[PDB]
Design an enzyme around this catalytic site. Structure first.
Site, PDB file in Angstrom:
ATOM      1  N   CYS B 118       1.179  -1.299  -0.075  1.00  0.00           N
ATOM      2  CA  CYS B 118       0.094  -0.438  -0.490  1.00  0.00           C
ATOM      3  C   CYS B 118       0.939   1.098   0.266  1.00  0.00           C
ATOM      4  CB  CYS B 118      -0.637   0.189   1.269  1.00  0.00           C
ATOM      5  SG  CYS B 118      -1.723   1.522   1.087  1.00  0.00           S
ATOM      6  N   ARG B 121      -0.494   4.671   2.421  1.00  0.00           N
ATOM      7  CA  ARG B 121       0.229   4.788   4.089  1.00  0.00           C
ATOM      8  C   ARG B 121      -0.310   6.082   5.417  1.00  0.00           C
ATOM      9  NH1 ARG B 121       3.521  -0.062   5.505  1.00  0.00           N
ATOM     10  NH2 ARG B 121       4.466  -0.087   2.961  1.00  0.00           N
TER      11      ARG B 121
HETATM   12  C1  HEM Z   1      -6.209   6.919   1.422  1.00  0.00           C
HETATM   13  C2  HEM Z   1      -5.824   6.398   0.554  1.00  0.00           C
HETATM   14  C3  HEM Z   1      -5.519   4.845  -0.097  1.00  0.00           C
HETATM   15  C4  HEM Z   1      -4.760   5.685  -0.845  1.00  0.00           C
HETATM   16  C5  HEM Z   1      -4.514   6.851  -1.997  1.00  0.00           C
HETATM   17  C6  HEM Z   1      -4.288   3.639  -1.709  1.00  0.00           C
HETATM   18  C7  HEM Z   1      -3.060   3.388  -2.526  1.00  0.00           C
HETATM   19  C8  HEM Z   1      -3.421   1.961  -2.869  1.00  0.00           C
HETATM   20  C9  HEM Z   1      -3.158   1.890  -3.969  1.00  0.00           C
HETATM   21  C10 HEM Z   1      -2.820   2.299  -5.183  1.00  0.00           C
HETATM   22  C11 HEM Z   1      -2.679   0.327  -4.239  1.00  0.00           C
HETATM   23  C12 HEM Z   1      -2.359  -0.846  -5.352  1.00  0.00           C
HETATM   24  C13 HEM Z   1      -3.234  -1.634  -5.212  1.00  0.00           C
HETATM   25  C14 HEM Z   1      -3.149  -2.958  -6.457  1.00  0.00           C
HETATM   26  O1  HEM Z   1      -2.041  -2.353  -7.464  1.00  0.00           O
HETATM   27  O2  HEM Z   1      -3.862  -3.749  -6.844  1.00  0.00           O
HETATM   28  C15 HEM Z   1      -2.913   0.097  -2.384  1.00  0.00           C
HETATM   29  C16 HEM Z   1      -2.590  -1.173  -1.878  1.00  0.00           C
HETATM   30  C17 HEM Z   1      -3.377  -2.139  -0.462  1.00  0.00           C
HETATM   31  N1  HEM Z   1      -4.194  -1.026  -0.044  1.00  0.00           N
HETATM   32 FE1  HEM Z   1      -3.857   0.638   0.365  1.00  0.00          FE
HETATM   33  N2  HEM Z   1      -4.150   3.351  -0.389  1.00  0.00           N
HETATM   34  C18 HEM Z   1      -5.105   3.774   0.688  1.00  0.00           C
HETATM   35  C19 HEM Z   1      -6.079   3.573   1.461  1.00  0.00           C
HETATM   36  C20 HEM Z   1      -6.121   1.548   2.230  1.00  0.00           C
HETATM   37  C21 HEM Z   1      -6.475   1.548   3.020  1.00  0.00           C
HETATM   38  C22 HEM Z   1      -7.521   2.709   3.869  1.00  0.00           C
HETATM   39  C23 HEM Z   1      -6.138   0.092   3.307  1.00  0.00           C
HETATM   40  C24 HEM Z   1      -6.495   0.103   4.410  1.00  0.00           C
HETATM   41  C25 HEM Z   1      -7.715  -0.003   5.677  1.00  0.00           C
HETATM   42  C26 HEM Z   1      -5.369   0.315   2.754  1.00  0.00           C
HETATM   43  C27 HEM Z   1      -4.811  -1.303   1.646  1.00  0.00           C
HETATM   44  C28 HEM Z   1      -4.333  -2.141   1.364  1.00  0.00           C
HETATM   45  C29 HEM Z   1      -3.773  -3.379   0.672  1.00  0.00           C
HETATM   46  C30 HEM Z   1      -3.789  -4.123   1.225  1.00  0.00           C
HETATM   47  C31 HEM Z   1      -3.223  -3.136  -0.551  1.00  0.00           C
HETATM   48  C32 HEM Z   1      -2.709  -4.404  -1.440  1.00  0.00           C
HETATM   49  C33 HEM Z   1      -3.889  -4.368  -2.223  1.00  0.00           C
HETATM   50  C34 HEM Z   1      -3.172  -6.190  -2.495  1.00  0.00           C
HETATM   51  O3  HEM Z   1      -2.959  -6.948  -2.149  1.00  0.00           O
HETATM   52  O4  HEM Z   1      -4.442  -6.392  -3.855  1.00  0.00           O
HETATM   53  N3  HEM Z   1      -5.475   0.705   1.477  1.00  0.00           N
HETATM   54  N4  HEM Z   1      -3.634   1.158  -1.818  1.00  0.00           N
END
Ligand code: HEM
Ligand code: HEM
Ligand SMILES: COc1ccnc(NC2CCN(C(=O)c3ccc(C#N)cc3)CC2)c1
Ligand SMILES: COc1ccnc(NC2CCN(C(=O)c3ccc(C#N)cc3)CC2)c1
Ligand SMILES: C[C@H](O)[C@H](O)[C@@H]1CNc2nc(N)[nH]c(=O)c2N1
Ligand SMILES: C[C@H](O)[C@H](O)[C@@H]1CNc2nc(N)[nH]c(=O)c2N1
Lengths: 421, 421
Positions: B118, B121
């Site tokens: 992510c 973060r």
């Molecule tokens: C506040 C704005 C946030 C942004 C801009 C952001 C952005 C991103 C991006 C660009 C990815 C890539 C997804 C992909 O390529 O499939 C990602 C993955 C991820 N995000 Fe964030 N995120 C945010 C919030 C969150 C929140 C609130 C959580 C959890 C409470 C979170 C948990 C994760 C996790 C676990 C992944 C991995 C997904 C996977 O393994 O397929 N994110 N995030």
């Protein structure tokens, strides 16, 4: 029995078995990955002060000899047996051994073929080998290096080549090229505080200066070759300017691009790596292929710690260089990449765009899996610095491991060297 | 005692000690790296058919409780002791335990904070938590999910949120969302052989159809929620169209862009991951943040196995879409990325460009190292799919490890599910 690998663009699956032939422990741990580390010990082969223990050498030599003979269309057991014996004897009588030229050629290609971070490996079998294992003086090294540069440059029609100097004996008489690459521009810290040339070579530039090289204080001063032969202190040698082919950067539409007064050398030659083969170690063996546009257009010209021309190009394009979200950097870097390719093309100098290179590697990787069930590949290095997912390599899962022969990194010579005087 | 990490843009060095708190063995082996694998077992937490052995649970619960209380500005040992005892007792009398809402909130943030893949973060402490551990029916799940979508969407002003359903008991009564993400478009294989909509959801689309969902055969049909509660067979639920906010794609200069008839949902919600905390496992807990432009502009619209609009945009720009070296793909994808950002902005919908996001993460990573000497990061996922080295994250060496709490992947439910009838 095999590691399953998948391409998420085609859904294609591949089975990797070649990784079984891997050597010592790799970069990553058991419960931690260090894949994004540039220089891990797992990829570095350091200096020695004593020969290679025969108990370790013999087995490795036997393996290589078997790999060598096993690569022929029609086997030749008799020669294979004889060779296996001749090597064992040589090791017993000399405590080491010599490779036949053909063996050497075979090894340099396999090592190239085994380079995880090389995207141009589909060209692996196309390599000119210069045998300089007879070299003995710095002056001789320099002449060999000049012959290499001239052959490889070929007036723009770049040819891949490698020059192999003497193999490490007791580790006290190593032939080493102190340069990172054969051709590289100097970097100077000016009086006014600014930096001129390539900031990346600041320290090395100073070292040359300390060794008697005269600083020309230009933006594109080709640094000198710093050569170390038979383990003696390094000697400096300016490269004959006629041997260094350069390309003047021009954009096919923006006439103000040449006003940037940029250029770059045509020869991409790695100068500081070590070739490991059948227990032997060649501390000095520069090699080259041809450039991939992004190295110059993106890394050399756009890295902030390098020539850093991105903002400049931005303004001259009338972009909102003050608002990141405007994606001006994406627009600027592409025009720069277009400049590089357009220029090498107009000046008839061999170069490859990253899209074509990626497809080339995909074909190679596919060939390798059929041919030998594997292809060591470092995703982090194989994906271009721009247009990531736009290239097929990005969607390809890969396995990174160290086979043999292999091209290793080495500790910077100036950090372990023992000066004569 | 620490792993040395370096940024090759600033030369800055960081010392990682946090990796010591890592769990079981990671992805890579000892002599082989599998960093580019999308779904390694090391990141997957599968199904169980029996409760968690108390010998394993208690220790983990004790650790979490300590981590929780250790996070306060001014300690509260008495409460800490009491809590440690209350938990031990609950485990002995019930064979498991319940988290306090505050503990749950703390855990969801840390898990987010511990997500290696992510890039957003820096927002980790800003998370709305919806406590649905009292849920018991599919219908109730659906209502909770609708409330989540509505809260998070907030009419364009996106807010990060997570909904936690009941924790796994014996593994035979798992609450599961069969969807990968809350909002996703259907994909249909048409009669004429072509594919309509998102080819990525072909199988899942068929599964919904098999469960009684009516295919609308459009290019952007929002798939239904497939819910599994208390371990019972999944029930289908169409999402109220009013709850799904969408953005119509428009370019700020190319009027022919809207002629492409493209749009995309505004809510990026992960629906299939499992939250692991202090020994407990929550098989169902969708969560969301806000989009990063490249996901839509590059992956959704340009992946060949997705909407694949790159060539189309190429032609409409009058580019040499027949010569790779012309770098038309680089020019096309950027205009598309510009369209996405321009559109979300014009329609007042929260979105972030990849440049700004990368800098955001760099600041975060730096904060984390000061705060706790580490930041699990997966370079391969953190570097945007375009403009790689143009972003600072690319030049940052990183360490990838699994801490706790953590957000794990799970085996697709339909492959391990035991249907009632
Ligand atoms: C506040 C704005 C946030 C942004 C801009 C952001 C952005 C991103 C991006 C660009 C990815 C890539 C997804 C992909 O390529 O499939 C990602 C993955 C991820 N995000 Fe964030 N995120 C945010 C919030 C969150 C929140 C609130 C959580 C959890 C409470 C979170 C948990 C994760 C996790 C676990 C992944 C991995 C997904 C996977 O393994 O397929 N994110 N995030
Ligand atoms: C024929 C054309 C070739 C192309 C287009 C090609 C392209 C590339 C590129 C783009 C890199 C990345 C360099 C960097 O990012 O620092 C690379 C790395 C590498 N190449 Fe190739 N290559 C070619 C030939 C060769 C040859 C002839 C050899 C060896 C005999 C070779 C050995 C390697 C090695 C070991 C690396 C890793 C360099 C490092 O670790 O710093 N390449 N190549
Ligand atoms: C062997 O065959 C090939 C074929 C195509 N490219 C390479 N790349 C190599 C790396 C890039 N090169 C440089 O000289 C360089 C290296 C580092 C920096 C900095 N900081 C600045 C410039 C040319 C050699 C090797
Ligand atoms: C949690 O917070 C955030 C914040 C920002 N982005 C994400 N990305 C997630 C992944 C991208 N998403 C999709 O729906 C999707 C996923 C896969 C495919 C395909 N093949 C097509 C579409 C939105 C959710 C999560
Ligand atoms: C930290 C990162 O490991 C180093 O910046 C990266 C990624 N990939 C690369 N890929 C290539 N081909 N050349 C490189 O220098 C780097 N460096
Ligand atoms: C094979 C590759 O592992 C997968 O294609 C990659 C790289 N990085 C990614 N990075 C993100 N952020 N999302 C991704 O899907 C992928 N996939």
């Amino acid at each position: 029995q095999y590691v399953r690998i998948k391409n998420w663009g085609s859904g294609e699956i591949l089975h990797d078995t070649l990784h079984h032939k891997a050597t010592s422990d790799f970069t990553c741990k058991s419960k931690s990955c260090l894949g994004s580390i540039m220089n891990p010990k797992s990829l570095t082969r350091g200096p020695r002060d004593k020969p290679t223990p025969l108990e370790e050498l013999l087995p490795h030599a036997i393996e290589f000899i078997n790999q060598y003979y096993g690569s022929f269309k029609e086997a030749k057991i008799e020669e294979h047996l004889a060779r296996l014996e001749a090597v064992t004897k040589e090791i017993e009588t000399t405590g080491t051994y010599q490779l036949t030229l053909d063996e050497l050629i075979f090894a340099t290609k396999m090592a190239w073929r085994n380079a995880p971070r090389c995207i141009g490996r589909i060209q692996w079998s196309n390599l000119q080998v210069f045998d300089a294992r007879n070299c003995s003086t710095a002056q001789e090294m320099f002449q060999h290096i000049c012959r290499h540069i001239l052959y490889a440059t070929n007036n723009g029609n770049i040819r891949s080549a490698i020059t192999v100097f003497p193999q490490r004996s007791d580790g006290k008489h190593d032939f080493r090229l102190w340069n990172s690459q054969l051709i590289r521009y100097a970097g100077y810290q000016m009086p006014d505080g600014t930096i001129r040339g390539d900031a990346a070579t600041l320290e090395f530039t100073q070292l040359c200066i300390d060794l008697g090289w005269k600083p020309r204080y230009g933006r594109f001063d080709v640094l000198p070759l710093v050569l170390q032969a038979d383990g003696q202190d390094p000697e400096v040698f300016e490269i004959p300017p006629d041997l260094v082919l350069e390309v003047t950067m021009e954009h096919p539409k923006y006439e103000w691009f040449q006003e940037l007064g940029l250029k770059w050398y045509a020869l991409p030659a790695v100068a500081n790596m070590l070739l490991e083969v059948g227990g032997l170690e060649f501390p000095a063996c520069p090699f080259n292929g041809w450039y991939m546009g992004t190295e110059i257009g993106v890394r050399d010209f756009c890295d902030t710690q390098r020539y850093n021309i991105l903002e400049e190009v931005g303004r001259r394009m009338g972009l909102e260089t003050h608002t990141l979200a405007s994606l001006w950097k994406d627009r600027a870097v592409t025009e720069i990449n277009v400049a590089v390719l357009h220029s090498f093309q107009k000046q008839n100098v061999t170069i490859m765009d990253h899209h074509t290179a990626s497809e080339s590697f995909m074909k190679h990787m596919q060939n390798e899996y059929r041919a030998r069930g594997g292809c060591p590949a470092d995703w982090i290095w194989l994906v271009p610095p721009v247009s990531g997912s736009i290239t097929p390599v990005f969607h390809q899962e890969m396995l990174n491991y160290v086979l043999s022969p292999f091209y290793y990194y080495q500790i910077e010579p100036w950090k372990t060297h023992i000066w004569q005087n």
